[PDB]
Design a protein around this ligand. Sequence first.
Ligand SMILES: [Cl-]
Ligand SMILES: [Cl-]
Ligand SMILES: [Cl-]
Ligand SMILES: [Cl-]
Ligand SMILES: [Co+2]
Ligand SMILES: [Co+2]
Lengths: 391, 391
Amino acid sequence: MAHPPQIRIPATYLRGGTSKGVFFRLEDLPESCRVPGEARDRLFMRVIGSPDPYAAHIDGMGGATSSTSKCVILSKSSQPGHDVDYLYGQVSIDKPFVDWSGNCGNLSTGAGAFALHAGLVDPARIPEDGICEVRIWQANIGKTIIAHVPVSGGQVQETGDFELDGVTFPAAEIVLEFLDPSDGGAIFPTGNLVDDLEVPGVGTFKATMINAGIPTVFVNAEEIGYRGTELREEINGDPQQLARFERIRVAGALRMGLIKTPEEAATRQHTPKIAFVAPPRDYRTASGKLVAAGDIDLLVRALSMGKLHHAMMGTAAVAIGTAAAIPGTLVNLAAGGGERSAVRFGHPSGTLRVGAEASQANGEWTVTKAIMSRSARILMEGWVRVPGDAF
Amino acid sequence: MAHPPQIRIPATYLRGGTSKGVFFRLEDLPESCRVPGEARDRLFMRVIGSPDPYAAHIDGMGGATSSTSKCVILSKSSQPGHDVDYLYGQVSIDKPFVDWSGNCGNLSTGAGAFALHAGLVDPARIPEDGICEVRIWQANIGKTIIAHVPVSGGQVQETGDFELDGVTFPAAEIVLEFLDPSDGGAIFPTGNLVDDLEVPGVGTFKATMINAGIPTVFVNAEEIGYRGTELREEINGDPQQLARFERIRVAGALRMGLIKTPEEAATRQHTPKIAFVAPPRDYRTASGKLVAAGDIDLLVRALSMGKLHHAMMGTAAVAIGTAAAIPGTLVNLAAGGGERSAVRFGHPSGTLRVGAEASQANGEWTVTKAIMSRSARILMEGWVRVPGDAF
Ligand SMILES: [Cl-]
Ligand SMILES: [Cl-]
Ligand SMILES: [Cl-]
Ligand SMILES: [Cl-]
Ligand SMILES: [Co+2]
Ligand SMILES: [Co+2]
């Protein structure tokens, strides 16, 4: 017949962190799609509803945003010491293209949960009640992610009271550890944990300039004239303040070797970031919610693209966690000094717990872990349908 | 336990026309949700991922647009001469509200298909191969919709080569008939099928002013200086042309009693619409595709909000079909006159087949049917999950 029925493909549609994706077990895919290739790419384009000239994904599982135009394959890992191989495809909205070159750290959370819903983890590793350490081989980039997935009654504990910025409703916390994570080069491009940063016409300030997550210039709130508790309204409305921060950011860029000249910074607004830190202090948000000093290890405020950020940027959260873990940095010192392999920092809209491990050898630091918390949940499970001739 | 597992609710996620919705059988809903009420509303808010302050529906089935924030309940009809009752809930994105007062004609297409996937139609009515006449009681507004759903092998024929504007991929055609469809009042507010419309400083033109679908002023292309084949670029770049059309539109508004004064039209830009018609003629689109005169019954071009529309507005498509069916209107005459209970018209980007039936009694016309074609397909089927405490 000219128009056979659609194919039904077992799938699970999950929220993983602040993204949605359609998840497949490798064995559930059509035979032609069980290796990488054009069939697989076509299949996922079609599941998602791409390429779409209307840019709306009305005819597929996509939501017409980068956060909602994603497919994931999990399989039992061939890689020693791992439970699952995790492959992530970013489906272009308007072009026929599936990009396999990246990772989605948000969908990693979903990979750990799905590994268990999918039956891909050795049951010797799954408690009746507790935590399952799901060992994920990120197959796109060749790196390990450990997802500590809570379990009740032998099944993933999905529900709970853990809040994640950008996730409307609270759910159960899944802690992720990115092992040996990888603008490359030295963690401390100046070779020092703290430098005297000269900012022409502004001052000379202590600063930690760190390349971890994202190149970031950190300074002490107090020294640059801030309390560390400031919210967006008291900064983002004063161009004089904002211009001053940019001067510090440019000075650090120069000192970090990210630009050769200060005018080069006009056209390099994304990195480095600029943030200021302080020891903990009670403060209230713009919303009205109180954060007590006892509840946090330090305060951090960061600017992105010339404005104070409302919470914290993802890669900058990694820079904080990394800097906190390395004793002697301004972030470490703000958090109390000594060992700080996990810290909870207060940002304008709430608090965030991050962590890191790092080691030293001939002055030279290596980051061995990035640690963060996210959540995941199943939205729908069953089968996706596509036309059989579409791939 | 403090956080029980999510509930799994049997559901089907379908595209119906140019919308997506989550479809339920009434019997599959939790007991508390099998009558209208707060539980049901909460359930659907939660399935969709509302209310969402981020306006992104990352934590639900919604797509954060009005077209993708919809839930549907079908049940076996209690209403004599009907197969299913069809209830549609529009879920607000940012407020906790489900609106049950409207219909979605696009999701009607999905209602007819789902009625069959859901097993809700008497099998005496379903062929092995042919068409199933699904008789839908639109429970929100109290009206009948007949969906002619194609069937192969005793199952809905979903796939096919029928194109619908706003639907990325072709699928099988489902013809819908809206029985006794219902700015109300007379179909012809002037009492005439054609009037002499005086447009100050522009001219006096034949016009059909019809209230069906939407109040529309129709004129003959030739008389107002157009060929009827014009595309957007040759009109939408000339303010003098656009101002002239608006004068005609205002003249018709006045004559239709929709405004008391011409200045009132400055703040009433949505109705009436203004369109011009012509007998069929070959033309090429901006894309480059040729439409032959033999393939169409007439040409129609409409303006909305002061600009030539790229195809045709939904409610204006109904006005065309209705006017075509009523012998003596300019639309009927453009289409060849006589009986025209279905017509295919050529618009700037393609062609559209619409239909109507109407009857006359003491000069007074009543529309008994609106007929149009759409398509539907299942995107995913199985179960949605929500937290059990969410509703
Ligand atoms: Cl195959
Ligand atoms: Cl496998
Ligand atoms: Cl219940
Ligand atoms: Cl029922
Ligand atoms: Co709770
Ligand atoms: Co085809």
